[PDB]
């Protein structure tokens, strides 16, 4: 598998726990801001997901996790990371900075084959597991696994559109805090509301996720837009989609369509519950999107509100592994 | 004014504060679970709204606030409260337990003239200041001031319906925690999700608010429904309204309509802002509904999402005093 | 083992997860406020400790957890719970109400052998695993496993006293919120600070734990007292003990004494770390007390501050199982 | 007054607010990361302290607050700030980065007369209002106002030492989060515990505060040390001081001593309360230290625990203005 990770942040580390869980193989990590002994500590301890159970240690300038030796690097510039020298073919680009094709192409200066951007890219091919993986051709060098909200929205939008046709829809995501937020009111020059104290506030925010679903499911291009509210919870978010449908249906037809899709073509991407769940019930959940049957409401036969949960750090990290496995199996077909 | 308050909770205490602010006169309070010396403390200290600036003391069995003596009762049964001894005529019923005309009518036994339920009532006429006060008549003995979410939604729905016609709408309220929630996972038999730990969770919840706007604005009956997400913040909530409109418009038309109504017929009830606000900016705000111009989004000429903030404790408490002042003017003209 | 539980609250449920983890056997549960289908939900979902992995279902009026059928009851009065009819010999008394010998003796009216109170008792024998289990005689019918803070304090106090002698000490516990607290300012007539909004505040509180250590380790009777600060975190607390010692020592002698005790006589009760830990690192931790080596400070050779972590719901629930196993093995010796 | 502020952060903005409240005159502000139109917004809205009641606007390249024009600079290097163009003489240095006399001396290049570091300095004389202002002399060019915790601890240590003699003491501060903490687990290389998610954790931390009281009250040098626990609240902290005393006393003697000092030599700096207060009761409090009479405990005649509250942002900011007013009186008498 020969995966390398650039950025050992929330995503970077959990992509490694995902890899180990799914038997994938990471062979190199890079982060300027985190020296190897600090990498041990950050990998081992996690406030949201719990301590890594298994051995993590620094041994001979390498990070060794459960026997797996992983070569470390602390390069500030992507051009200077020796991927070739570690044996890393498939690079996961987790920094939140080399997101355009141009920028992620710096990983070619060190011998990387393919770059998977772990965020929406301005111009790299965006994929969402369960929804558009067949669009992936072997000549695609720099791809994107899109955002965490797009991976929750696009499964649910695919089922609603295929069965009842989405004429238009507006989305809100009630979203957990992230690392770009501030503990107390401080400077966020590009997003003034985003700098206000994260634990004190409900914070309106923008999201490009609904619009990006028009790239992943081309039929919906231009039919979806939305916004976010950031609220004080450490992880797990929820999509609230209000949709105008082309075909008359009951809410029970929407629940049966979600249940059938989660048992077959979207098995493991889309889950389904009828339980009285709340957001802590999905911490550690592996799926991209979990349809909450009892929280949605239907106003009329064509106007309805659907609720889908997602663990924004964890399900996404497992999908990064899934996109890699598929890319390899296609390129090694 | 001769107002009496039954239930000295978040709403009961802040109605006293609003009354003192607006020069209204409370002459008696009743609460079985709060003894006079404890009422001093609870009124004096408020974790969300600050310490009361003024003298508060227990003197001769009364609560004395800035010189005014308030008779205190601690009667469990409404029919047993001697409202006539204190001279209390207009009774704010804020226990949350006597919300029907049958149950609220117990106050009449004690000599009360009028009862104002500080919650939706299944049968007492519901009022929202700035929207339907013209329907109140002096023979109405028991009235309701509806809920805090209906007082936010109904102003904004009035402006949109009058200018562009609401064909149908679905509402979400992202709502601060309340007193019925639990600090840790505990038993809430009639609402399982509502018993999960309030500080840890985004909790889906039901709201009658959008249905109740159909009773306040009769032409919207059956065209609106919605739900709540309870999130970990101590006060201030936001209504997210997705609406399908009868007339084509731009978002600038919606903003100009809201600005014009906050300057005229709805001044003091609906506010307007174009700043980068977050929920802590509305703590202590007196208005029922503050339209956030920059957070809404319009997908097409007839489908848009509108965001309005409300301090669910404080703005509602000022409206209770406003409704009472309107009623006494009608009952004495 | 034939354990029964009265009160399926935070402790009641986690004592059952502890039992299942440790192969103990629970055969009956009682709680008026929780009907069997709601018991399934509360056992299955836990905001702090995660979903029970394994099957939980209601089957023939019994709760069935991983194959174990458990007889349910919903008695409001302890005298009316048929322990005899379920086969429950050893009762765990988790309600927070039948804490005196008198009150816990109501479980004899239904055929219970022994009662383990899961809180400090005013007069039942208090035990702390690793510290005074040899004081337990077979004739003791109603015992107490003391408080969660006493189970964290007494291990650490036992090591400091045995090695250096505690002349006097003062304790603070920075303690996570509990179920007796309120989401927003509400009535707590017996503890006015305890009613103020739990997520908004640092709340001074009393604790009897330091004083109770004088009952568990008689030599320290009268030498320890302390207080609590309740802070907004859902679980895991920390003891901050400032102690005046009889013998001159360095801080490294205190760390070596804690490490030796955790490897031998207090193995599994007292743990030891030198890592840069924070409270989420101990969620799910099984030990009663985890000495934090790097956070303590020594001012002089006889005056020092020691920091010990504890998961107040979880380690305590496992110790309830441990006290039961020891009681049985002594009574079945 | 002719005050200039360098760094327009929590402390920089609240010193402007304190100055306007106390009729002091700020004539210039400098901050490289905050443009003039963004400074309007950040000063106008405050999630902890409320919206500024007054007009705030950007006019002709200046910040105009209630009529007063303030020249704005956005210089990264202190030696480059044209303080003399604006007429700024007394410079509040609140960036947190130029805390030594060498580094703070950069302001002299621009024409500043005096610099007040709003933090502990390794070498500038440290002052605490009400405790050692008498030591300031007009030849002192760079002074420090110490930290917020030293300003809480030093009043209370002064009263105890003067009346009962402190033999030795260990301090804990349970402290609100600050701007150096992280919303989720992220990199803090020089302080690993400090990078763990601030909203989820009780985080042990170091504090120089108790050592620094030894420099402010020379007779306490080497007799006090302590630590911090950072807990999830946005403002207001509490000092928990365990002290061994030279003279035998009762707790009523300690309370009477504190009451007497808050009425005389320390009025306005040390407050006193006997109510059931919690941290939200001190948001916006002007005092440096509020002795909580009911929360302290005395184990014996010479060993006791004292609790004092402080609004770490607001009371400290008023003391910055107080220190400056004292200095100008000495520099012009
Ligand atoms: N947080 C989530 O829920 C989530 C979900 C989906 C996608 N993402 C995306 O993943 C990306 C990373 O987000 P995160 O939440 O893990 O953030 P983070 O702040 O936890 O991680 C960023 C990491 O990149 C490192 N870094 C910075 N510069 C570097 C460089 N020049 N080279 C290599 N490493 C460097 C930082 O030190 C840090 O460890 C972002 O684009 C984010 O939008 C995050
Ligand atoms: N909290 C808000 O934001 C909000 C907003 C609008 C309306 N309301 C409504 O106002 C009502 C009260 O809500 P709250 O938030 O003040 O709750 P709360 O729990 O803070 O207050 C309820 C109070 O009534 C008292 N009480 C109970 N039984 C009584 C009795 N039998 N007789 C007299 N007093 C008694 C309680 O001791 C308590 O002080 C509810 O119907 C609620 O839905 C609340
Ligand atoms: N929460 C902790 O961290 C912790 C730690 C140590 C000890 N304890 C103690 O354990 C006891 C229970 O605490 P908890 O935190 O689990 O509280 P909780 O509120 O979660 O549980 C109390 C339970 O008792 C039930 N109950 C009430 N009356 C009953 C009755 N008459 N008969 C049977 N069941 C009834 C309630 O419905 C509830 O489920 C308390 O004494 C508490 O001090 C708690
Ligand atoms: N927050 C409190 O409770 C508190 C209390 C007492 C003292 N302090 C101290 O005050 C100082 C500032 O703390 P804060 O809480 O205001 O933090 P903050 O992060 O809110 O503010 C620091 C400000 O200085 C600015 N800045 C950074 N580099 C600059 C530069 N080179 N030139 C000019 N301005 C620059 C930043 O943009 C920011 O606005 C620190 O030393 C802190 O320890 C804080």
Describe this structure in words.
The structure is a homotetramer of 333-residue chains. Chain A is α/β, with parallel strands linked by helices and 333 residues long. Chain A has two domains: 1-146 and 313-332, Rossmann fold (3-Layer(aba) Sandwich), CATH 3.40.50; 147-312, Dihydrodipicolinate Reductase, domain 2. The first copy, chain A, is 26% helix and 26% strand. Chain A has helices at 10-21, 36-44, 83-86, 101-104, 148-164, 209-216, 251-263, 314-331; strands at residues 3-6, 26-30, 56-59, 62-65, 68-73, 90-93, 114-117, 142-144, 166-175, 203-205, 224-230, 237-245, 270-273, 289-300, 303-310. The first copy, chain A, has an eight-stranded mixed β-sheet with strand order 3-4-5-2-1-6-7-8, with helices on one face. Chain A has a seven-stranded mixed β-sheet with strand order 10-11-9-12-15-14-13, covered by helices on one side. In chain A, helix 4 links the parallel strand 6 (90-93) and strand 7. In chain A, helix 1 crosses helix 8, helix 5 crosses helix 6 and helix 5 (148-164) crosses helix 7 (251-263). The longest helix of chain A has 18 residues, at 314-331. At the A-B interface, strand 9, strand 11, strand 12, strand 14 and strand 15 of A face strand 9, strand 11, strand 12, strand 15 and strand 16 of B. Chains A, B, C, D: Its EC number is 1.2.1.12. Chains A, B, C, D: Homotetramer. Chains A, B, C, D: This is Glyceraldehyde-3-phosphate dehydrogenase. Chains A, B, C, D: InterPro entries: GlycerAld/Erythrose_P_DH, GlycerAld_3-P_DH_AS, GlycerAld_3-P_DH_cat, GlycerAld_3-P_DH_NAD(P)-bd, Glyceraldehyde-3-P_DH_1, NAD(P)-bd_dom_sf.
């Amino acid at each position: 598998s020969k995966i390398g990770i650039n950025g050992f942040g929330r995503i970077g580390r959990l992509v490694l726990r995902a890899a180990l869980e799914m038997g994938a193989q990471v062979v190199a990590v890079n982060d300027p801001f985190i020296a190897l002994e600090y990498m041990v500590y950050m990998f081992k301890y996690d406030s949201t997901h719990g301590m890594f159970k298994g051995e993590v240690k620094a041994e001979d300038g390498a990070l060794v996790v459960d026997g797996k030796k992983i070569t470390v690097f602390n390069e500030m510039k992507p051009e200077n990371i020796p991927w070739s020298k570690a044996g890393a073919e498939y690079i996961v680009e987790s920094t939140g900075v080399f997101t355009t094709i141009e920028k992620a192409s710096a990983h070619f200066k060190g011998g990387a084959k393919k770059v998977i951007i772990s965020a929406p890219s301005a111009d790299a091919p965006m994929f969402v597991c369960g929804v558009n993986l067949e669009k992936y051709s072997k000549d695609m060098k720099v791809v994107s696994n899109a955002s965490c909200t797009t991976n929750c929205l696009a499964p649910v939008a695919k089922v609603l559109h295929e069965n009842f046709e989405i004429v238009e829809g507006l989305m809100t995501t009630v979203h957990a805090v992230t690392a770009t937020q501030k503990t107390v009111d401080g400077p966020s020059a590009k997003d003034w509301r985003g700098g206000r104290g994260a634990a004190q506030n409900i914070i309106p925010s923008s999201t490009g996720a609904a619009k990006a679903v028009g790239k992943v499911i081309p039929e919906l291009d231009g039919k979806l837009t939305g916004m976010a509210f950031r609220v004080p919870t450490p992880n797990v978010s929820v999509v609230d989609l209000t949709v105008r449908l082309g075909k008359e249906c009951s809410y029970d037809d929407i629940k049966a369509a979600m249940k059938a899709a989660s048992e077959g073509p979207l098995q493991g991407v889309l889950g389904y519950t009828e339980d009285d769940v709340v957001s802590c019930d999905f911490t550690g959940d592996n799926r991209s999107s979990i349809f909450d049957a009892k929280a949605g409401i239907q106003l009329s036969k064509t106007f309805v509100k659907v609720v889908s949960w997602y663990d924004n750090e964890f399900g996404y990290s497992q999908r990064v592994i899934d996109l890699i496995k598929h890319m390899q199996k296609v390129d090694s077909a």
